[PDB]
């Protein structure tokens, strides 16, 4: 049987494999960054709906998708009220900022609301609770590289101010541009194309 199927798999499968290529030979990614064909009919507006080359993406996990509505809160919320807890992670000056500055506190709350909305989004994108996703940057390995390059020692209290995280990520979301433009249609499609990575 294996010797027969070896021979048989040869003939058909290659036919399967020419027809595909002839159907798709000229489909390519234009400088518009859209995926068109010979006659220039637009097949995809962005390559793969995201505009990213297939090599550079990896297997990551969506942290917010799985967890319960309570383990999500105690993990993505950054309570500012536990002064004792803050002085553990944050230095003695950052805590008094976080402990006192109403703008800091409300900005952190706004961030948590944004994560909560992203969570509901993810749960409409990935029902069945499938945390495993394919995305360009390996964030957890970049973080781990950061811990190993600057010698973090995750046991001393850190000097990274929370809102420097918030605003740094906000500003980073600006530089990961897939659909270039300031037009509402282009800001919308940039927001969509970089929605899961964001």
């Amino acid at each position: 049987e294996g010797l027969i199927d070896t021979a048989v798999k040869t003939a058909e499968t290659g036919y399967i494999q020419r027809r595909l290529i002839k159907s798709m030979e000229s489909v390519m990614v234009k400088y518009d960054a859209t995926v068109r064909n010979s006659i220039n009919q637009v097949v995809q507006l962005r390559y793969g709906e995201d505009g990213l080359a297939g090599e550079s993406v990896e297997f990551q996990n969506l942290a917010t998708l799985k967890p319960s509505n309570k383990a999500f809160e105690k993990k993505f919320r950054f309570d500012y009220t536990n002064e004792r807890a803050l002085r553990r992670t944050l230095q003695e000056d950052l805590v008094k900022d976080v402990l006192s500055n109403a703008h800091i506190q409300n900005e952190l709350e706004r961030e948590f609301e944004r994560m909560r909305e992203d969570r509901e989004v993810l749960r409409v994108i990935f029902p069945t609770g499938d945390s495993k996703v394919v995305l360009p940057c390996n964030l957890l390995r970049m973080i781990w590289n950061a811990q190993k390059i600057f010698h973090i020692n995750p046991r001393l209290p850190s000097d990274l101010h929370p809102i420097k995280v918030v605003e740094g990520v906000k500003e980073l979301s600006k530089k990961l541009v897939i659909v270039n433009g300031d037009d509402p249609l282009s800001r919308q499609a940039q927001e969509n194309a970089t929605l899961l990575f964001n």
């Binding site: 390995r141 781990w144 590289n145 190993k148 390059i149």
Partner: protein, 49 residues
Amino acid sequence: PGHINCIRTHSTHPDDEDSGPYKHISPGDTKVVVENGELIMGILCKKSL
């Protein structure tokens, strides 16, 4: 090369090892850990190479 970081489980890694103790000090030297481009732990196999 460089400072790679990755974690892998050697093919024989017993699945009940990450639950009990010895989680980070594996009896059978499964659990490949590379840190700063340094093989700290674990046997390498197809799962890691």
